[PDB]
Amino acid sequence: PQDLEFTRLPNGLVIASLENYAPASRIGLFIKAGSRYEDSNNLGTSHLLRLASSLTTKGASSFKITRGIEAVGGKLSVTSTRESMAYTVECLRDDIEILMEFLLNVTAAPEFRRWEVAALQSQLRIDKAVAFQNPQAQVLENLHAAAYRNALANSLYCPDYRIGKVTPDQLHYYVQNHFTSARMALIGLGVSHPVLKQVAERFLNMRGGLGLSGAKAKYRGGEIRDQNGDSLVHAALVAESAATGSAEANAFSVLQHVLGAGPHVKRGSNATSSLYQAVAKGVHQPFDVSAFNASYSDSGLFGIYTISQAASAGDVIKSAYDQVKTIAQGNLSNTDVQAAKNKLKAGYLMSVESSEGFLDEVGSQALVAGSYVQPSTVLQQIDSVADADVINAAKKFVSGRKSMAASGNLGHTPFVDE
Amino acid sequence: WLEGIRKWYYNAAGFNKLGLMRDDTIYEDDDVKEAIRRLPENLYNDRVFRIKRALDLTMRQQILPKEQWTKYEEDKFYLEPYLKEVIRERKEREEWAK
Amino acid sequence: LETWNIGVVLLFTVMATAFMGYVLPWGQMSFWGATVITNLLSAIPYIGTDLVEWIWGGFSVDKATLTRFFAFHFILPFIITALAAVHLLFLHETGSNNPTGISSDMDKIPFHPYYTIKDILGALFMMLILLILVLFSPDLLGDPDNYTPANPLNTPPHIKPEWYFLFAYAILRSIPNKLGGVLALVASILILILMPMLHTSKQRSMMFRPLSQCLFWMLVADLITLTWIGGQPVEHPFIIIGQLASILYFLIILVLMPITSIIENNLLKW
Amino acid sequence: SHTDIRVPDFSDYRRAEVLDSTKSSKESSDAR
Amino acid sequence: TLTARLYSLLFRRTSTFALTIAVGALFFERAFDQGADAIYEHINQGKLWKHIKHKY
Amino acid sequence: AALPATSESPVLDAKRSFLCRESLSGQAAGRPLVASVGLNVPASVRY
Amino acid sequence: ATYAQALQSVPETQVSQLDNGLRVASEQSSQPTCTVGVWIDAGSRYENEKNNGAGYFVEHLAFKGTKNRPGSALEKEVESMGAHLNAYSTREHTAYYIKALSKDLPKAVELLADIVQNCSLEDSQIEKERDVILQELQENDSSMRDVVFDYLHATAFQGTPLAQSVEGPSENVRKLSRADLTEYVSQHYKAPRMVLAAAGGVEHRQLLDLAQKHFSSLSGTVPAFTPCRFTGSEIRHRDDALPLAHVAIAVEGPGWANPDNVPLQVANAIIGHYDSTYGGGTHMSSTLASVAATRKLCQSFQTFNICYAETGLLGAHFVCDNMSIDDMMFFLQGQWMRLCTSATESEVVRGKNILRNALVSHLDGTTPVCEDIGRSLLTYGRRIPLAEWESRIAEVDASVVREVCSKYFYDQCPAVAGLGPIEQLPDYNRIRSGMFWLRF
Amino acid sequence: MTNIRKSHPLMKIINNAFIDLPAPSNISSWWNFGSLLGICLILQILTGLFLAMHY
Amino acid sequence: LSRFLGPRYRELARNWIPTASMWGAVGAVGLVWATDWRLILDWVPYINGKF
Ligand code: HEM
Ligand code: HEM
């Protein structure tokens, strides 16, 4: 099924293509354009930009894009993290030229007409309310606001006061400063490399440079508490860990899977999760606990996420934190680290099974590192991680300053200091 | 000269005697309604006051002083591009519908 | 559209009412006008004669026709009242047009103080004209021969319908063919239903359209010509005058007005 | 508790064509 | 069944339903008037002008 | 797109309750959240 | 490839059988991970009113211990290799599967055989799962879509075992004993009704050797299936405390093996789906989606083709505020009628493209392919290749769509479920009249 | 707690048609002939009925 | 007109032609029946007896 072909053009744009010969083709344009590039004056600009695909472009009207992508059964999706924006077109392999022209019009020639932009402010409210129906969305937003001072402190969602105020000039300035060639990677699964090169030649010649150089994320170490009475309390307690793609980051991944990083068995007991066992020793109420890992280009957050009854919130949090401290005290066997490595490696290989997952991995790799590495190298990097590296990471979390975000009835929730 | 006839007709039409521009007098169908809805707010407010003043003038069966009349060479076709774009979108929808 | 179409319906119904009411005095003009305009319905192919004899209730205009015309004349204005109510219902969905042809929502006023008093003064003026007619020239707009009782064995030397039919009468007398004449007479009112489809101007009103005003006043003068001609005998000068007047009537509405509006559009660079 | 909801038996009102639960009701639909 | 066939052929579409109703109205008027008239002239047999006209 | 999405999006609608530890299991977050929108697909969030 | 050569290059599902009648099916790739599972022809439609819920209860107890792996030991083993154990139950099918590394397939296969063959069904665990299942019933009550589809099944298939819910009524949950569950497993977990599927980096010969080493004990070489009458009917649960109303309307659609399914799916793609978080809104080719976006008539709508062996639910589910239900019905039924009488070729082309895209995009990853293999061998006795699905889609036109939507939708009695502030949900006679057109 | 002219169901529609109806501030005498017609109609029904008492 | 024409509208015409001609036959039969138009009715076998 051929081999991944990865090249970097003189404009700095990256193009990577794997022709797997699958009936469907998937093309993603990955850009360093997340909400970490906003400042205090244009918060929510990139959220409206995420919602702004399928608006009129210089080469195709809004009706043309909607109707002409639905005609071929195609899909146009925009997925944002705090650091990246990925624009994906997926369709059958015979219709990829139409979808690629649409994608290139969307990213390189956006028009941001004032009436279409003013008729899109309502979906900021709709989109954010739908996301905030999950109690974790706002807890993670508050955790980033309380862990950072400036850059990663920015929400993926528009501030409520900024809704109805994100202007077309903010969108134009944003695209002109973040959608540049040396910040972009076009990655096609199920396409030929020369085709992607011709696509990258017909467009994507904005500046061939680095655009606006966003600020370094500054650790804050604060606490945000959202009393809202919800039956459950969601609490996140983190410290600064490491930037993505390092030996320390891999140690933090192994530590996440030592502590427990989500369930493997349906309705199970999370037996191999040491955090879960520590909490279930004393907390006989319904609960969930996992280790939380958030790695970024210039920083990272490692800690614990707990969901519990309002009454038992403190007991769950103290139990989890003391289990982490016990790992920091050098109590960590080789079998548990082998099991954690197996979990991590299996999860990594399973994430790239789908075309969406493999495309996302290749795109993030091309943005963060500017190079592609096969899963075998990733797995042996996981293998290289030693026991002392895990013990460390846990020490760094324990000794590190903490940021906390909780939501629910917090009358029994501790503070960062207690 | 075509422009002699054009300026003659602009004087004879006489909406300039009311302070109106040509695009103020257009019959408001659905295309024109969307075109007016897409105007920037300053142009919309100018249009609204111009039209209100002209209605106030015709209510008295009066016209403005000749100094205040819209000069033919100063008539701003402010609504023309918005209307052309609205009509282009309608025409595209219809071409799709066939 | 909806109020204009209701108005066309109202025009036809008012004409039917007035026509049937004019027969009620049973004078010479009543009888012979009913005779001519009912016999116009025989020109309909196949079912025409049966339709006329059924409307008559007999072989000619006679007792059955008079009593049924009284009944229809009594009932029709109430149908007109309902149609005028529907008319106003449709009109209030948009409000009124205005002389500039421009939407005026930024300058609306309450109806009561302003247009109740304006409509009342208009009503007083209408009453003045009507009372001058009633109290000073009661017979100015009528024919002396309707003061003679109807005589089925003696046709009046002239048979002219009421003045407010004469234009259509002139139109119907212009074309020799019976059925084509009737079709032209009906088209001279059904053509009002074509005005929206024939509108090619960028502007709603003719306030800023000098050439369309010229054509409009030609159409008014031509309708006055047709009224005069329909009041005159079918003789040498009046035949050719009425024929050219009818052709002009249709050629303005269907041809000259849209082309002239297109020319005006181009003169305004749109 | 929504799984505790059962439609009541409508056999008393049913047409004879559809009294059996084990039969396709399409096979009588046209006739019905 | 017969009613399944009638529905499938003549009742499913409203235009064909209406055509069946129109043709049936014509044939029903004919047959119903014929039957009702025969009943009325049997009840009143010999009493009507038609029954006795052939003597005059 | 062609496929409907594991979950459609009612705003102003209570989603689901969690009453058991078995249901609560997996609801804790482990990775930073991503936000996804789509022309013809339900919007999603992931943690 | 040109999508015609790419379909022809898709790997072939290899199928074998054990002497006991267990079918073994695998689609191989070069991926370093696999999904392997057991799909069983067992569901709630196989349960009567006294046993209803037993299959869900057995799925609940599946991973809680076998005679070889007591309690958490099994879970530990799965978790100790990075694998993921999952299970599900429907009214007709039950599945237990593992996502593992390709080198873990032997153990995974072993772990599955044990799970289906030697579940402990311990009474203490049965009581703990009784409590869990009651709490999950109350959790499912909170999901308006799940409730409205249970209601739709209950009224459409009233008097039949297809009206039953998967979980059963809470009274059965409280009353089911170990003897009930052992009887359910002994009568439904049989080799002739099971399929061992595997998709991914799995060689068929090796999987077959594993199945012969771990499943050969199973039943060698009987109550199963009665047809389920469909009923035009409505069930309306009014709760004006609910912010949004859910409405599900379905006619009797075809069963699994009926070719009419392919045109009908095409037709559903013409109507499409929508929710208020869509980019396209007013510009969508689906008329209902564009009207719903322009007028804000609903929060979402979806078409569905639920299939059982011999019947199914063909219809639509929508969510809207109290004052728009009527509109949502009017525009939805109208679309149905517009398809029955005036389908039109270009939107049939669009719907065909949508269907091909749905079929190809769905089969992305080892787990969807493993489910496709298992469920396909249960419903068709075969894995239908995507080239065949494409052949069946290519033979659809507007005449075919008009004919099949006429056969299933036009002048048919629907089954209707309403939940919430549904006072404006139209009366059943009005909906039934909306199922035909007088102009036509 | 309410103006009868706006609350009462018959007065509501009379009010909306002839009192509180927004009318253009600049409609001329040519716009009077609607009400005139409505008056003419009424006159014809009145006189006519009194004529019908003897005809 | 321009907004009309095109393959889709000609296909709609073809789709509705059977229904239109069926309603035409319905109107024809109903008009023949209501007015007792013998010009056609004299050819209908049993109805022929009514004249
Ligand atoms: C029974 C006789 C009629 C009555 C009582 C009547 C009544 C009215 C009234 C009261 C108005 C509002 C006031 C006005 O603008 O004049 C009006 C407006 C109107 N009528 Fe009539 N009308 C009648 C006949 C007609 C006829 C014959 C037509 C022509 C087809 C017509 C078309 C209109 C139109 C288009 C308007 C709106 C005019 C505008 O706002 O610019 N009506 N009618
Ligand atoms: C639309 C409103 C009406 C119009 C346009 C109208 C018109 C006419 C006309 C032109 C005449 C003949 C006048 C003449 O003798 O020269 C007449 C006569 C008559 N009308 Fe009316 N009429 C209307 C309403 C009514 C109504 C509603 C009635 C009955 C209540 C009525 C009763 C009569 C009677 C009895 C006559 C015969 C006596 C007479 O000649 O004056 N009219 N009508």
Author numbering:
A (entry chain 3B): 21 to 438
B (entry chain 3S): 12 to 109
C (entry chain 3P): 110 to 379
D (entry chain 3E): 79 to 110
E (entry chain 3J): 5 to 60
F (entry chain 3I): 32 to 78
G (entry chain 3A): 2 to 222, 228 to 446
H (entry chain 3P): 1 to 55
Give excerpts from the publication.
CIII2 transfers electrons from ubiquinol to cytochrome c (cyt c) and contributes to the proton gradient for ATP synthesis. Comprising three core subunits (cyt b, cyt c1 and the Rieske iron–sulfur protein (ISP)) along with eight auxiliary subunits, each CIII hosts four metal centres (haems bH and bL in cyt b, the [2Fe–2S] cluster in ISP and haem c1 in cyt c1) and two Q sites: Qi for Q reduction and Qo for QH2 oxidation. From our high-resolution maps, with local resolutions between 1.8 and 2.4 Å except for the dynamic ISP, we unambiguously identified all reactive centres and built atomic models of all endogenous ligands. Further well-defined densities in the Q-binding pockets were identified as structured lipids with their phosphate headgroups tightly bound to the surrounding protein regions. Tails of these lipids create a hydrophobic, dynamic environment for Q-binding and release. Our structure showed a hydrogen-bond network near the Qi site, comprising water molecules, polar amino acid residues and the phosphate heads of three lipids (two cardiolipin and one phosphatidylethanolamine), which form a Grotthuss-competent system for proton transfer. The network could be divided into two hydrogen-bond chains primarily constituted of water molecules that link Q10 to the matrix. One of the two chains further branches above the three lipids that is directly involved in facilitating the proton transfer through the hydrogen network. The second chain, comprising 5 waters that surround H201MTCYB, is directly connected to 4-carbonyl of Q10. These chains provide an explanation for how the rapid proton transfer process is achieved in the Qi site.
